[PDB]
Design a binder for this molecule. Structure first.
Ligand SMILES: Nc1nc2c(ncn2[C@@H]2O[C@H](COP(=O)(O)OP(=O)(O)OP(=O)(O)O)[C@@H](O)[C@H]2O)c(=O)[nH]1
Ligand SMILES: Nc1nc2c(ncn2[C@@H]2O[C@H](COP(=O)(O)OP(=O)(O)OP(=O)(O)O)[C@@H](O)[C@H]2O)c(=O)[nH]1
Ligand SMILES: Nc1nc(NCc2ccc3c(c2)OCO3)cc(-c2cccc3[nH]ccc23)n1
Ligand SMILES: [Ca+2]
Ligand SMILES: [Mg+2]
Ligand SMILES: [Mg+2]
Lengths: 440, 420, 67
């Protein structure tokens, strides 16, 4: 059992969903028609991949997933694209008119008209589970739908499924590919309203991904496709422990216990290696040591910040492929003797390690090399609060003049919601300060 | 999805027709309404501006309005005149004689209901109407007064749809008709309250461009309208061809309008090459379609649209360069206020082009000019009997003047604001 | 000890229910307040336009009673 349900919200969430499900199909040997010849138990089973896929009597393997957008053109591409047969039509839900980059339309004016249908389709998925574990929610911070509708949905899920865990994958805005001036408003509004409803959230900064694609894959001007394929490799590293078995495999829930010391402090920093082109991977085999070292190079982080000027509260290493513990231990010993790794005084310094043997996969025609071994580090560090600071400053500059605020008031919001949200962010920055001070 | 287009009065109808000619040419639609293009990119978002009729015929979603009949004849004989729906022509007999009060309160009020019937029939069959664009001048009688009446009535029936205008501002260099500053102030008073977006197309600037830069010693209306049609084509490019960007009129408005009253834009066009040259030229005062120096104010927001095949890396680098070297002209309290679009399909007869849309506080210079001419007459009450004879009070003139002065003062307030 | 065990499990049930209750009531208050504000915004706009139509009628009734 232990099933998980994925929810993909708005453009960014949908398109990242496409990249993730394509990659999962390649990892498990599922064809685009849904057939899986290696699966000899027809119509059911409790194999590890059944946490993410259900099975019909006709042998089709069907994602446990809902896609939601308030306009139709992005999800229409899924309806007509390569993987159109993977999904039942009731899983693909669209309205007619979007939120126009406005949190208030996604949470209230437009969002209210579709929330009950979305919840009922989710209920249909939940009823097929024999031991549902929780939810995975994919969305942008900056869009009207990804911010406001996601907020609304999280509130309703807490009502209908109680304390059942909810995890986020959240796209943090960058000016190089950003399309709206108001993205800082939406980011604070959704972060305030979701903070009590989420158990754990993985932020992905578009500027970090853009930089990595340019520097390591030699792509002059990266597209959404490049970014989403790399993101999907990180997501796959995180969920691999849920989707494959094995004796050195370590459950993600067990990492959550270690990653979250207080309910509000639930935002891990992800780092992935190696990201390398085919031309450079040739005749250059990367060892366990080289990739483990690369996990402490800030240029490989998913969020721009400097862990060397904060403190660690947890540090986890998720290996996949041709990796044995002996080489892990030698690499860790070296890193401990060489780098600036300072823990808070109320927390032990041991690194937690997992190994999955199933090797990494790449998509055909991609810009990533196929490699024999890879690693994802997840750290809980105070340095991540720098990203909140950057966003809060931009919020202040505009709000002092009330710029664009009339667009929100016209949909029924009050200024009090702006200032209440901003205060909650101020208190979060203060929490991150308090957890790094020494005991007395 | 669907946009409904309205053209009112002589000026509005002439530039409307040119707009429909240029975009019909860009989409490969002939005067009979048949598609004979070479590329699927031409039809993918065709329905934004065109209806499909039987026989795969494409008919503009366009309504044609005047109090003067005969402009209807000149349109109908124009090259694309057969393409328009015959029932969409709504024309009176009387004329308005350059009198705003006739357009807004008397002759135009009688006809407005028949105009609304056609509007409603077109709107009812839209899958998902985004809103409306109107072309008119502010200096005559029909387009200014009756057009702003139409705007008010549409807002009553579609209060949640976007209302956009392309509004031609008068200049003594093109028309000597003496009452024009009255008509423009009275219309602006309406526009501040009831539109989401107004492109200020200034006949002063168009004349100076035709004379100095294009070297036309005696500019005709045709030369001015060539510039207008190229600008309007540029500014609707991002809705009209498939291309990285997923937007509707409301999301554009949300990106461009930080305060509801400050929604009067300065358009530009280049050339009248390399990406640095286009970029330098589009930010030059001499390329603006409003007679304003942007270095006499600050930008609240800017959109830049490039057309043709070129390097996106290079476009990004040049936009950053202009911002870095001209940083004093962008208000510091709105981060990331410059947006860029690239369309692969060039306009007819050019390999590369740029269209500029600016929300600048320097637009106050335009409003000041008009204001000066207004006061010069109002202080002697010259020609006022033309308007009071239609039932108007002096008081309405006083209020309109006051509101335009307030708009100026507000632009100055945001020009002087700082961050610390 | 057995009675303490029963108090622990009852406290856990109670806290889960109280969290559900408070989130439901907070959501309902917000979704009502937003509806009221939006409808008031639209009603003020319509009322301003109707006052405009009234003024246009008084103007035409001025021009008729001039002659
Ligand atoms: N990484 C990544 N970011 C994306 C993608 N698509 C959009 N974004 C980012 O998401 C933000 C815009 O939000 P969208 O997802 O496009 O908006 P939306 O949820 O559809 O909301 P509305 O369209 O306003 O109703 C910008 O910061 C984009 O850079 C994507 O495919 N991948
Ligand atoms: N740029 C440009 N301006 C024009 C054109 N035609 C007229 N104008 C300007 O329009 C202003 C006069 O307004 P009109 O459009 O003629 O007035 P109208 O809407 O037709 O109303 P009436 O003629 O009184 O019935 C003058 O200032 C002209 O300079 C044109 O084709 N191009
Ligand atoms: N405000 C605004 N901007 C426009 N283009 C600039 C822009 C491009 C890409 C952007 C962006 C802004 O914001 C984020 O991405 C066009 C328009 C318009 C007006 C009237 C009629 C129209 N028919 C089609 C368009 C349009 N209106
Ligand atoms: Ca099976
Ligand atoms: Mg969208
Ligand atoms: Mg005329």
């Amino acid at each position: 059992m232990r099933e998980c349900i994925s929810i993909h919200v708005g453009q960014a969430g949908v398109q990242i969903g496409n990249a993730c499900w394509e990659l999962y199909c390649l990892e498990h040997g599922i064809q685009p028609d849904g057939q899986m010849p290696s699966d000899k138990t027809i119509g059911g089973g409790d194999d590890s991949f059944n946490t993410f896929f259900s099975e019909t009597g006709a042998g089709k393997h069907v994602p446990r997933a809902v896609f939601v957008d308030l306009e139709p053109t992005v999800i229409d591409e899924v309806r007509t694209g390569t993987y159109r047969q993977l999904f039942h039509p009731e899983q693909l839900i669209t309205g007619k008119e979007d939120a126009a980059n406005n949190y208030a339309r996604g949470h209230y004016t437009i969002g209210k008209e579709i929330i009950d249908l979305v919840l009922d389709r989710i209920r249909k998925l939940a009823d097929q589970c024999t031991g549902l574990q929780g939810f995975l929610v994919f969305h942008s911070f900056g869009g009207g739908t990804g911010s406001g509708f996601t907020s609304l949905l999280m509130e309703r899920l807490s009502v209908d499924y109680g304390k059942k865990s909810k995890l986020e994958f959240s796209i943090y805005p960058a000016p190089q590919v950003s399309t709206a001036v108001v993205e800082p408003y939406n980011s604070i509004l959704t972060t305030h309203t979701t903070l009590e409803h989420s158990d754990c959230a993985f932020m992905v900064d578009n500027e970090a991904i853009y930089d990595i694609c340019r520097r390591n894959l030699d792509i002059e001007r990266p597209t959404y496709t490049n970014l989403n394929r790399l993101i999907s490799q990180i997501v796959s590293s995180i969920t691999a422990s849920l989707r494959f078995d094995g004796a050195l495999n370590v459950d993600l829930t067990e990492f959550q216990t270690n990653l979250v010391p207080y309910p509000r402090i639930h935002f891990p920093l992800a780092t992935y290696a190696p990201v390398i082109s085919a031309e450079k991977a040739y005749h250059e085999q990367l060892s366990v040591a080289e990739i483990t070292n690369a996990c402490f190079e800030p240029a490989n982080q998913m969020v721009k910040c400097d862990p060397r000027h904060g403190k660690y509260m947890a540090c986890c290493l998720l290996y996949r492929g041709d990796v044995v513990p002996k080489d892990v231990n030698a690499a860790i010993a070296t890193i401990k003797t060489k780098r600036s790794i300072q823990f808070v005084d109320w927390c032990p310094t041991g690194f937690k390690v997992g190994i999955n043997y199933q090797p990494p996969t790449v998509v055909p025609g991609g810009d990533l090399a196929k490699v024999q071994r890879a690693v994802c580090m997840l750290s809980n560090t105070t340095a991540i609060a720098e990203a909140w600071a950057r966003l809060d400053h931009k919020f202040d500059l505009m709000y002092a003049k009330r710029a664009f605020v009339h667009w929100y008031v016209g949909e029924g919001m009050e200024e009090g919601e702006f200032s209440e949200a901003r205060e909650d962010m101020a208190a979060l920055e203060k929490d991150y300060e308090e957890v790094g001070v020494d005991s007395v | 999805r669907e946009i409904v287009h309205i053209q009112a009065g002589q000026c509005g109808n002439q530039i409307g027709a040119k707009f429909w000619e240029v975009i019909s040419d860009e989409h490969g639609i002939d005067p009979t309404g048949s598609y004979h293009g070479d590329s699927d990119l031409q039809l993918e978002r065709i329905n934004v501006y065109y209806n499909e009729a039987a026989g795969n015929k494409y008919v503009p979603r366009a309504i044609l309005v005047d109090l003067e009949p005969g402009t209807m004849d000149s349109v109908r004989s124009g090259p694309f005149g057969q393409i328009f729906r015959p029932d969409n022509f709504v024309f009176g007999q009387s004329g308005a004689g350059n009198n705003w009060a006739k357009g807004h309160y008397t002759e135009g009020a009688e006809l407005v209901d028949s105009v609304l019937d056609v509007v409603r029939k077109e709107s009812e069959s839209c899958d998902c109407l985004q809103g409306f664009q109107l072309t008119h001048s502010l200096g005559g009688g029909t387009g200014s007064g009756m057009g702003t009446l139409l705007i008010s009535k549409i807002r009553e029936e579609y209060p949640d749809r976007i209302m956009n205008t392309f509004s031609v501002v008068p200049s003594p260099k093109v028309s000597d008709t003496v009452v024009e500053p009255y008509n423009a102030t009275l219309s602006v008073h309406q526009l501040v309250e009831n539109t989401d977006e107004t492109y200020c197309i200034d006949n002063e600037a168009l004349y100076d461009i035709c004379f100095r830069t294009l070297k036309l010693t005696t500019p005709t209306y045709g030369d001015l309208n060539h510039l207008v049609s190229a600008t309007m084509s540029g500014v609707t490019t991002c809705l009209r061809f498939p291309g990285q960007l997923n937007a509707d009129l409301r999301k554009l408005a949300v990106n461009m309008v930080p305060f509801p009253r400050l929604h009067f834009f300065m358009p530009g066009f280049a050339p009248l090459l390399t990406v640095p040259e286009l970029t330098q030229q589009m930010f030059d005062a001499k390329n603006m379609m409003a007679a304003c120096d942007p270095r006499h104010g600050r930008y609240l927001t800017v959109a830049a649209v490039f057309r043709g095949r070129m390097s996106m890396k290079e476009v990004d680098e040049q936009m950053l360069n202009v911002q870095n070297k001209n940083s004093s002209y962008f208000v510091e309290w709105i981060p990331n206020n410059v947006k860029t679009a690239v369309c692969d399909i060039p306009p007819r007869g050019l390999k590369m082009s740029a269209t500029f849309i600016g929300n600048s506080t320097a637009i106050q210079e335009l409003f000041k000019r008009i204001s000066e001419q207004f006061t010069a007459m109002f202080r002697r009450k010259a020609f006022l009997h033309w308007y009071t004879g239609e039932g108007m009070d002096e008081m309405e003139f006083t209020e309109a003047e006051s509101n335009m002065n307030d708009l100026v003062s507000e632009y100055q307030q945001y020009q002087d604001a700082t961050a610390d | 000890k057995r009675e303490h065990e029963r108090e622990v499990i009852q406290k856990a049930i109670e806290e889960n229910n109280n969290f559900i209750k408070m989130a439901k009531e907070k959501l309902a208050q917000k979704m009502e307040s937003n509806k009221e504000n939006r409808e008031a915004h639209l009603a003020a706009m319509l009322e301003r336009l109707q006052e405009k139509d009234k003024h246009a009628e008084e103007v035409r009734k001025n021009k008729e009673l001039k002659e």
